[PDB]
Short mmCIF file of C-alpha atoms in Angstrom, two decimals:
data_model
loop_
_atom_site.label_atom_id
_atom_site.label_comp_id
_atom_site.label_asym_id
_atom_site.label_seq_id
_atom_site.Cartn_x
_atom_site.Cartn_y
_atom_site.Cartn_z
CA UNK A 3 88.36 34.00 94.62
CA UNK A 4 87.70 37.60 95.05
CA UNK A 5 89.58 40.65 94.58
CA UNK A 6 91.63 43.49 92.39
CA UNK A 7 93.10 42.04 88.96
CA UNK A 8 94.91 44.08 87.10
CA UNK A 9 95.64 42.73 83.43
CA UNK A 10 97.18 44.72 80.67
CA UNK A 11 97.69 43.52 76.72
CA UNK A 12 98.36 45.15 73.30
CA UNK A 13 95.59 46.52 71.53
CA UNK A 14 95.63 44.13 68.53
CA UNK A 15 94.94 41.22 71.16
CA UNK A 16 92.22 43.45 72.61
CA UNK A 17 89.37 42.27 70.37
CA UNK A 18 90.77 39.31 69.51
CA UNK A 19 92.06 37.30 72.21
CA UNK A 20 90.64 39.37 75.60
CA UNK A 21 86.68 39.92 75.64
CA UNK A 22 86.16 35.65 75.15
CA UNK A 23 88.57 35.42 78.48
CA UNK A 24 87.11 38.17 80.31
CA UNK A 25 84.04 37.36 79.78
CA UNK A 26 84.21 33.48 81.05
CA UNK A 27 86.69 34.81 84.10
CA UNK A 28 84.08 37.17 85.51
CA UNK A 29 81.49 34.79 84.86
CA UNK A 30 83.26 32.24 86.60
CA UNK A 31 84.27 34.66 89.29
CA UNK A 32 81.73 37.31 89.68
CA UNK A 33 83.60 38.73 93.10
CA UNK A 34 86.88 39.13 91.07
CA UNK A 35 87.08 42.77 89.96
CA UNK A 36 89.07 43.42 86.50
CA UNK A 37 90.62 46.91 85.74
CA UNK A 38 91.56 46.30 81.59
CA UNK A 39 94.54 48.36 80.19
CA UNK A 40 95.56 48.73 76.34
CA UNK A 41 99.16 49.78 75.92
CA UNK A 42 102.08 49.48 73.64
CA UNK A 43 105.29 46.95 74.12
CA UNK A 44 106.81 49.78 75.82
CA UNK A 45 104.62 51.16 78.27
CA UNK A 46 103.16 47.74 79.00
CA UNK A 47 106.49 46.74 79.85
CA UNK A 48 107.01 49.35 82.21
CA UNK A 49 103.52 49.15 83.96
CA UNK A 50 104.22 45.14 84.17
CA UNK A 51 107.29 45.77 85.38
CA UNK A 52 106.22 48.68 88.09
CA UNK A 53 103.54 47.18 89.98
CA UNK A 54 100.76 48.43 87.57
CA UNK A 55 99.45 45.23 86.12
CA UNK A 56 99.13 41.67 87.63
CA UNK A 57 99.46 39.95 84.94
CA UNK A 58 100.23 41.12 80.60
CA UNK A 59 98.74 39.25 77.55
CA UNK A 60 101.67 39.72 74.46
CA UNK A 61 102.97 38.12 71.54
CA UNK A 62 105.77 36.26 72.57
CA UNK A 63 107.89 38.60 71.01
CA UNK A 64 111.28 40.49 71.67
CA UNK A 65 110.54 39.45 75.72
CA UNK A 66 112.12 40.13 78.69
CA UNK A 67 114.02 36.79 79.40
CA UNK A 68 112.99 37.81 83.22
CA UNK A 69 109.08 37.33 82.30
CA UNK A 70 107.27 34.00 82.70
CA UNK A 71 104.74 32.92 79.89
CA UNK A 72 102.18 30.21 79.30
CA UNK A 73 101.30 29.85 75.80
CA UNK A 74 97.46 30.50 75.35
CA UNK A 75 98.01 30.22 71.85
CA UNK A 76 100.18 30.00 68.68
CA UNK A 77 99.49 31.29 65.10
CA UNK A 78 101.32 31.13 61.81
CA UNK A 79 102.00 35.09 60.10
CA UNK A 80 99.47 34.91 57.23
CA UNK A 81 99.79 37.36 54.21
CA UNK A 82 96.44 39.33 53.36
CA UNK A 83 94.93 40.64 50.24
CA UNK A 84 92.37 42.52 48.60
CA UNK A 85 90.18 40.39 46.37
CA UNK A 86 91.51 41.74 42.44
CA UNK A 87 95.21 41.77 44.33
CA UNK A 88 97.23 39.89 41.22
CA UNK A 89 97.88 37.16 43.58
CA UNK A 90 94.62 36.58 45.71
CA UNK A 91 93.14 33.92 43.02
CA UNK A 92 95.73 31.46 43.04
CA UNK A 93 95.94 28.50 45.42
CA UNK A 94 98.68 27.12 48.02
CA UNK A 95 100.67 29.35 49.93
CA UNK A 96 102.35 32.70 48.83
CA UNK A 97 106.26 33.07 48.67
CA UNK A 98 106.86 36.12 50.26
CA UNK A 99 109.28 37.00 47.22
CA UNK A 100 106.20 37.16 45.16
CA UNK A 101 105.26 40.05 46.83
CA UNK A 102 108.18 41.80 46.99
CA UNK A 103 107.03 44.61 44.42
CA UNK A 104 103.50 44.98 45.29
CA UNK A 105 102.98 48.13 47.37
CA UNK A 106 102.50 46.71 51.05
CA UNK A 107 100.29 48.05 54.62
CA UNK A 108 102.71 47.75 57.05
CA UNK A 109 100.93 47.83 60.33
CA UNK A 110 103.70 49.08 62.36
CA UNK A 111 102.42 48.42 66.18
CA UNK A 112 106.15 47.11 68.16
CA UNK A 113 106.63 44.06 68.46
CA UNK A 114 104.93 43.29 64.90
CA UNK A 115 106.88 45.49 62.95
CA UNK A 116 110.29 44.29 63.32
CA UNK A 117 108.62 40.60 63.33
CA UNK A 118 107.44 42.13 59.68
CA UNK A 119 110.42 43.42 58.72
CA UNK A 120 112.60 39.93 59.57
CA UNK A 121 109.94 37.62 58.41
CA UNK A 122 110.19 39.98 54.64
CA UNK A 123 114.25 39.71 55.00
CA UNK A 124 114.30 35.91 55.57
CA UNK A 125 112.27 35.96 52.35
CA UNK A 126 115.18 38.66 50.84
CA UNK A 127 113.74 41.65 50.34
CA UNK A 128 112.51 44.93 52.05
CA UNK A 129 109.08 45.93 51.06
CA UNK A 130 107.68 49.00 49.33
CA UNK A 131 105.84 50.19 52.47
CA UNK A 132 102.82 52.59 50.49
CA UNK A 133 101.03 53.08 54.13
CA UNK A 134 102.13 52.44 57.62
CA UNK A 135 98.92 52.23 60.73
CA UNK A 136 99.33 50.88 64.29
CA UNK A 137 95.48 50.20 63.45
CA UNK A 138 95.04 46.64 62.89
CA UNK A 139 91.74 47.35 60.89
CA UNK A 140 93.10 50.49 59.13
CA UNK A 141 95.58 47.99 57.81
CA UNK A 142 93.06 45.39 57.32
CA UNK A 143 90.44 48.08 55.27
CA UNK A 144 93.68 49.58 52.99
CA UNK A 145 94.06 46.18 52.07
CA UNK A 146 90.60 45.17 50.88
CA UNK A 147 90.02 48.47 49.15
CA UNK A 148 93.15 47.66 47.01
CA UNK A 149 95.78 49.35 48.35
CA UNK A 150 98.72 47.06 48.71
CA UNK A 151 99.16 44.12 50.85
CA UNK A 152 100.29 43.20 54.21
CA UNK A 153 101.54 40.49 56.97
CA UNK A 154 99.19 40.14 60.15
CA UNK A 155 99.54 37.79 63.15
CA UNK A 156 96.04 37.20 63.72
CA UNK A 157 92.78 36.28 61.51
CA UNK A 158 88.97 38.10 62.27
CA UNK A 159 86.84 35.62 62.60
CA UNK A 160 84.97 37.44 59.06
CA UNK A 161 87.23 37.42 56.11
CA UNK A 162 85.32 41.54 55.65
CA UNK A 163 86.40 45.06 56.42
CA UNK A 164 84.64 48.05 58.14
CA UNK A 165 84.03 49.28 54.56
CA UNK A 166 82.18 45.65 53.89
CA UNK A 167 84.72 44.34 51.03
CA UNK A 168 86.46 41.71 51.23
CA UNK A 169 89.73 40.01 52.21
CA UNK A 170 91.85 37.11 50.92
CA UNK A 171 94.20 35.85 53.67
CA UNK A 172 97.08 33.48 52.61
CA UNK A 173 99.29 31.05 54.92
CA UNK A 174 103.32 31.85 53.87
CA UNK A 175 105.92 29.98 52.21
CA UNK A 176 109.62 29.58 51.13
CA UNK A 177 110.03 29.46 53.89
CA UNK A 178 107.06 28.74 56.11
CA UNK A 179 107.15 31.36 58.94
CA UNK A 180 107.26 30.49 62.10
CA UNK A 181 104.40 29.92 64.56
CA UNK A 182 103.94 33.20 66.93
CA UNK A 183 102.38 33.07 70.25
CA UNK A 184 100.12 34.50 72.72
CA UNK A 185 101.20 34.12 76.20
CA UNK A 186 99.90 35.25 79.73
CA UNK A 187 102.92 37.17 81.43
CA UNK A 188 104.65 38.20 84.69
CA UNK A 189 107.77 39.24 85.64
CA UNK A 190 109.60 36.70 87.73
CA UNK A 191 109.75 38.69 91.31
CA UNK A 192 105.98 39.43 91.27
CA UNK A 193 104.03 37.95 94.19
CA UNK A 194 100.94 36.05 92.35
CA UNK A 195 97.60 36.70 94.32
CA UNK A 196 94.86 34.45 94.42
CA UNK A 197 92.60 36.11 92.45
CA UNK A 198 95.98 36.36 89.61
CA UNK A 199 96.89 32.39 89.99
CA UNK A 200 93.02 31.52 88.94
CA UNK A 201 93.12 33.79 86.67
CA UNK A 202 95.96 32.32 84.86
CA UNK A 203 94.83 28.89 85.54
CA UNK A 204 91.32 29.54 83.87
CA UNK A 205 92.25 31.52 81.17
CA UNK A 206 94.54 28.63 79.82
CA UNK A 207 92.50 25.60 80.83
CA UNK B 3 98.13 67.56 39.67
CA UNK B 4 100.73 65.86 40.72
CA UNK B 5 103.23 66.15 43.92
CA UNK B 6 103.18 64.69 47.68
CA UNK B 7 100.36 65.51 50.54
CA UNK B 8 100.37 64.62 54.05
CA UNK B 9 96.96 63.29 54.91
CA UNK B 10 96.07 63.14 58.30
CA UNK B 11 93.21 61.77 60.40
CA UNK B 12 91.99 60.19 63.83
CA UNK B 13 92.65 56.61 64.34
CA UNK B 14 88.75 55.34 63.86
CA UNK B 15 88.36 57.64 61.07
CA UNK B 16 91.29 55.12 59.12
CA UNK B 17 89.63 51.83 58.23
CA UNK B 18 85.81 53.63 57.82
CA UNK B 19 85.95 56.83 55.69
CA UNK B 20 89.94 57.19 54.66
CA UNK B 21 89.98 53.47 52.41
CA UNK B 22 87.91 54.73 49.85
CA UNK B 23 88.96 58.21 49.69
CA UNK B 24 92.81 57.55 49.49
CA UNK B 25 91.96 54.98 46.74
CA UNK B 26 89.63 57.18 44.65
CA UNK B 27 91.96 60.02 44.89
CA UNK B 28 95.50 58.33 44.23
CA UNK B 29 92.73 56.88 41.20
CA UNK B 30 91.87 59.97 39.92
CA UNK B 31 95.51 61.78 40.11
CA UNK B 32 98.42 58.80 39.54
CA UNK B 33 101.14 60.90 40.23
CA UNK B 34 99.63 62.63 43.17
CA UNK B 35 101.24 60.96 46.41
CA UNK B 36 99.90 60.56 49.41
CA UNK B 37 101.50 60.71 52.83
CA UNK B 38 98.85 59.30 55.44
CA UNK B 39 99.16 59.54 59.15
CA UNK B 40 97.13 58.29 61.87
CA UNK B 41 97.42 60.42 64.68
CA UNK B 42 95.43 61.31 68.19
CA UNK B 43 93.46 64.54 69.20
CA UNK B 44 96.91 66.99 69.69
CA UNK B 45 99.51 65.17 67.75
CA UNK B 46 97.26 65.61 65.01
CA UNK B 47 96.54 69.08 65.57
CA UNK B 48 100.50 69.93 66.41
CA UNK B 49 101.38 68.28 63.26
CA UNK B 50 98.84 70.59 61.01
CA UNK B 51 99.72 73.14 63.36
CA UNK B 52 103.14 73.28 61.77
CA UNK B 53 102.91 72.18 58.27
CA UNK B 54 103.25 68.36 58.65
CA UNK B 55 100.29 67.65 56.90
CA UNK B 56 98.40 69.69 54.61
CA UNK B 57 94.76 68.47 55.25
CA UNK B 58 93.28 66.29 58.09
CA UNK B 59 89.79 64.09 58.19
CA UNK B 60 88.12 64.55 61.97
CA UNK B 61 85.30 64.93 63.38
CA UNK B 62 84.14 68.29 63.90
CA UNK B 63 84.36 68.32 67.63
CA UNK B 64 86.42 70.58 69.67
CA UNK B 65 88.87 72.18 66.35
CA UNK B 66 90.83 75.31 66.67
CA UNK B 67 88.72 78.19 64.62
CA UNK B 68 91.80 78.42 62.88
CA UNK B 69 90.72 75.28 60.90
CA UNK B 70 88.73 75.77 57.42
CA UNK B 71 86.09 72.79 57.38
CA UNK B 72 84.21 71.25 54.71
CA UNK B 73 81.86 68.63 55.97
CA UNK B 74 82.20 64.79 54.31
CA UNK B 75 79.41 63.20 56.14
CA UNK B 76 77.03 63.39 59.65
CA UNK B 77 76.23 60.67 61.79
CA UNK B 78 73.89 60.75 65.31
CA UNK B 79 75.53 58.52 67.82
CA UNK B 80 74.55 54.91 68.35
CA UNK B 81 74.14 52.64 71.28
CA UNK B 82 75.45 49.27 70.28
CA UNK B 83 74.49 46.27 72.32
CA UNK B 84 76.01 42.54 72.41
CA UNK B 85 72.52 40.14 71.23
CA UNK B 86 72.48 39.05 74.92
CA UNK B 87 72.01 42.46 76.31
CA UNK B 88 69.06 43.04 78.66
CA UNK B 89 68.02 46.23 76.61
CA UNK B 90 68.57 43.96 72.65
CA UNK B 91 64.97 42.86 72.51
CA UNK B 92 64.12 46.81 72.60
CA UNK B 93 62.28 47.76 69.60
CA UNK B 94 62.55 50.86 68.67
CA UNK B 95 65.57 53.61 69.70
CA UNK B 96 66.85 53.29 73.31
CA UNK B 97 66.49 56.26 76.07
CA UNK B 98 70.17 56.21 77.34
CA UNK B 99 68.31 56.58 80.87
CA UNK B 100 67.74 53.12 80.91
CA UNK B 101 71.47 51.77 80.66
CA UNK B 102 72.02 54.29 83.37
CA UNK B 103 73.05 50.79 85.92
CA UNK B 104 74.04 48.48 82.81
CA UNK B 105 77.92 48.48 82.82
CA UNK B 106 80.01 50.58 79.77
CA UNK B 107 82.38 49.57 77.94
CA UNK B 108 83.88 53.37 77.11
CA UNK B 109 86.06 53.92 73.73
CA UNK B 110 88.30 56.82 74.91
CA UNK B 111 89.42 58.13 71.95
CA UNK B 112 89.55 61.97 72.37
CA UNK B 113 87.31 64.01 71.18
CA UNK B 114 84.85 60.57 71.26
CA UNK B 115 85.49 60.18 75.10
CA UNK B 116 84.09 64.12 75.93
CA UNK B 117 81.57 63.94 73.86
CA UNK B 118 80.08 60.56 74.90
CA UNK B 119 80.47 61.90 78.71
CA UNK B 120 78.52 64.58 77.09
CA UNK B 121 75.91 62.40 76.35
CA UNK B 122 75.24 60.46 79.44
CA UNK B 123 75.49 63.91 81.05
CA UNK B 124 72.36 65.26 79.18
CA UNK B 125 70.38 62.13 79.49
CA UNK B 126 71.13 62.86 83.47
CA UNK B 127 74.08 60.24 84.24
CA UNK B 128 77.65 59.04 84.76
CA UNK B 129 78.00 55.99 82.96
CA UNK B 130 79.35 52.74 85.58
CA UNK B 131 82.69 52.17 82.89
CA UNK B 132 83.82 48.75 83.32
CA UNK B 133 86.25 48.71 80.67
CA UNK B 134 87.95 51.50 78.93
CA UNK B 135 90.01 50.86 75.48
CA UNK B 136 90.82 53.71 72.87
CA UNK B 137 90.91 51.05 70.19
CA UNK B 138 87.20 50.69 68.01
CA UNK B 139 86.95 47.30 67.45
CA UNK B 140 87.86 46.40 71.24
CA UNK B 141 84.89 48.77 72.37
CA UNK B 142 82.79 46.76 69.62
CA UNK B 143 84.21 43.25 70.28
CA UNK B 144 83.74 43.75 74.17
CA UNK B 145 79.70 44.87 73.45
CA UNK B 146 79.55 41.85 71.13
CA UNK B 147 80.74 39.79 74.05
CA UNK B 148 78.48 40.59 76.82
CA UNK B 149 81.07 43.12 79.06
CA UNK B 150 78.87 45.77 78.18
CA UNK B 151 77.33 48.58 76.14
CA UNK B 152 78.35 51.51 74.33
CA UNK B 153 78.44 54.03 72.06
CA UNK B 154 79.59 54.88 68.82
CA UNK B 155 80.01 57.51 66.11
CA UNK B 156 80.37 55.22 63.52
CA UNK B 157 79.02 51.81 62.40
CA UNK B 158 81.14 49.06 60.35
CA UNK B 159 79.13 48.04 57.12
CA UNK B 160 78.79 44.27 58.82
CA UNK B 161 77.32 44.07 62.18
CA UNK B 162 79.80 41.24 63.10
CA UNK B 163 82.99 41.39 65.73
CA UNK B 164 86.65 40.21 65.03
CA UNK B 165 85.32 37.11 67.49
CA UNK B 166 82.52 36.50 64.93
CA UNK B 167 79.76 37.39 67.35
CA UNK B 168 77.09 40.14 66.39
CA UNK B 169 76.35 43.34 67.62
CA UNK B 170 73.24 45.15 68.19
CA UNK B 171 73.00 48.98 67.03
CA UNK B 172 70.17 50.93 68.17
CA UNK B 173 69.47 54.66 67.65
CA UNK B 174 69.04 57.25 70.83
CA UNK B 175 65.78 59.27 71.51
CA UNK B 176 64.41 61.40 74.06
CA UNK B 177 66.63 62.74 73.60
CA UNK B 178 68.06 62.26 70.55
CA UNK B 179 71.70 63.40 70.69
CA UNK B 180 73.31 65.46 68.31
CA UNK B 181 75.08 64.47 64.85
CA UNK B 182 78.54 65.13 64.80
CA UNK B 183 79.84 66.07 61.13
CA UNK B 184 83.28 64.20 59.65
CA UNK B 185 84.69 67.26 57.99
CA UNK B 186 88.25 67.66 56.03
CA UNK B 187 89.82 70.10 57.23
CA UNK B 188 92.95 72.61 56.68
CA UNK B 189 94.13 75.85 58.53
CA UNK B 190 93.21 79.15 58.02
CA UNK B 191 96.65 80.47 57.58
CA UNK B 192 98.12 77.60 55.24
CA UNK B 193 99.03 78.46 52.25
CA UNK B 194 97.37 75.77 50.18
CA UNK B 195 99.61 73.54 47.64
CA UNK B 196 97.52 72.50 44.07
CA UNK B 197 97.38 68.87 44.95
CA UNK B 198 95.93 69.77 48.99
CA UNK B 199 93.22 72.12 46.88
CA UNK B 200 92.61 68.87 44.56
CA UNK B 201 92.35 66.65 47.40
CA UNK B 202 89.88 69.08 49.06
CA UNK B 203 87.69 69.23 46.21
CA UNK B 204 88.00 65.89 45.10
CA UNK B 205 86.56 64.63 48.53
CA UNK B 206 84.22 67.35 48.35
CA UNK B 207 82.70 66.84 44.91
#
């Protein structure tokens, strides 16, 4: 197992979900040769799609029906809050009603915004969006300074911000979202290599 | 004061120095509102350029002379290492020199990816980049990781990835590189509003 891989994936899987697998692939494959590409749902899509990438790592979100996916994992929407937010003290799940007035951080980074904007609908309401990022920890640091709440698909391992405060991360309820994945991609008429087959074979074992 | 501004800044400036600022402002003036935008090198620019926003946070690297600037803060640039690292048992402030083979991990977020080019350059080398991301906490998760080194303008209060794994920050010597300032900043030709002059001063004070 030697060779080119191409692998592309949005940035808010970047630090979460990529430098554990690349790190273990290369190890496990020193000859293998990884060129690493950020991009958004769109131009990922079209790099994918082109010839670009081998291979994408995405929320299984708003997907080309023509792409093939193994789940690497899956992950409940979780609400987040700074730790004097009126709500961050009491225990059990929030209702997403609850929240409904409370000046929200809308990270708005495709496909999570729209996945935002349903799960807040399903719960009846559109929120009072105070700030919008496609930063994950811009939204993250709003929030523990106190300046509204938001609705993130994945957890930091360290319930802290860049600033050093704190955050107060809630599971959802009424109703209880559903689970959102992380999946290795590839479109359907794409040729797998080697070195791309044990890459997707390692990185889900 | 009272009224709307458009607050802009550079994506890694919006979870470290904008949290605090937006909070104490929007503190001190409650019917001041603030419109913030995250926004790369030219957007940002072409957006103050024609009246979009009324102030923007950046580093002072590469700005029109057009722009007024008020330094916030300075920082030297920082090598930050995963605990791993050949070089993390260094005591004492790294010479670059000595990563010259060690493999990058390069954040290329213009004006950041110049000006660490820059220096490499005056330390005598092109960096080996084997990963490039324009997203902080990828560069910092990837270094925590093992993929690589790298460096950085700023430094997150807690020296601890999105993975949970550490990260090793060492000062630069011989030589030391230059501080860059974090300045807000306005143009020359605007014709400041009351709340843009509070802001200014506020963050100033």
């Amino acid at each position: 197992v030697a060779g080119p891989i191409a692998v592309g994936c949005y940035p808010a899987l970047g630090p979460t979900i990529l430098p554990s697998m690349l790190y273990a692939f290369t190890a496990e494959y020193p000859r293998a040769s990884v060129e690493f590409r950020e991009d958004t749902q769109n131009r990922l899509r079209t790099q994918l799609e082109g010839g670009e990438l081998d291979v994408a790592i995405v929320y299984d979100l708003d997907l080309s029906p023509e792409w093939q996916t193994v789940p690497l994992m899956t992950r409940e929407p979780m609400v987040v809050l700074g730790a004097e937010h009126p709500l961050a003290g009491v225990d059990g799940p929030v209702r997403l009603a609850d929240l409904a007035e409370h000046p929200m951080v809308l990270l708005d980074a495709p496909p999570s915004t729209n996945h935002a904007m349903d799960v807040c609908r399903e719960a009846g309401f559109a929120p009072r969006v105070a700030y919008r990022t496609a930063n994950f920890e811009t939204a993250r640091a709003f929030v523990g300074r106190g300046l509204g709440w938001t609705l993130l698909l994945q957890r930091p391992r360290v319930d802290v911000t860049y600033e050093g405060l704190p955050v107060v991360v809630k599971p959802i309820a009424e109703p209880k979202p559903a689970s959102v994945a992380v999946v290795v991609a590839w479109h359907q008429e794409a040729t797998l290599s080697r070195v791309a087959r044990a890459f997707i074979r390692f990185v889900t074992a």
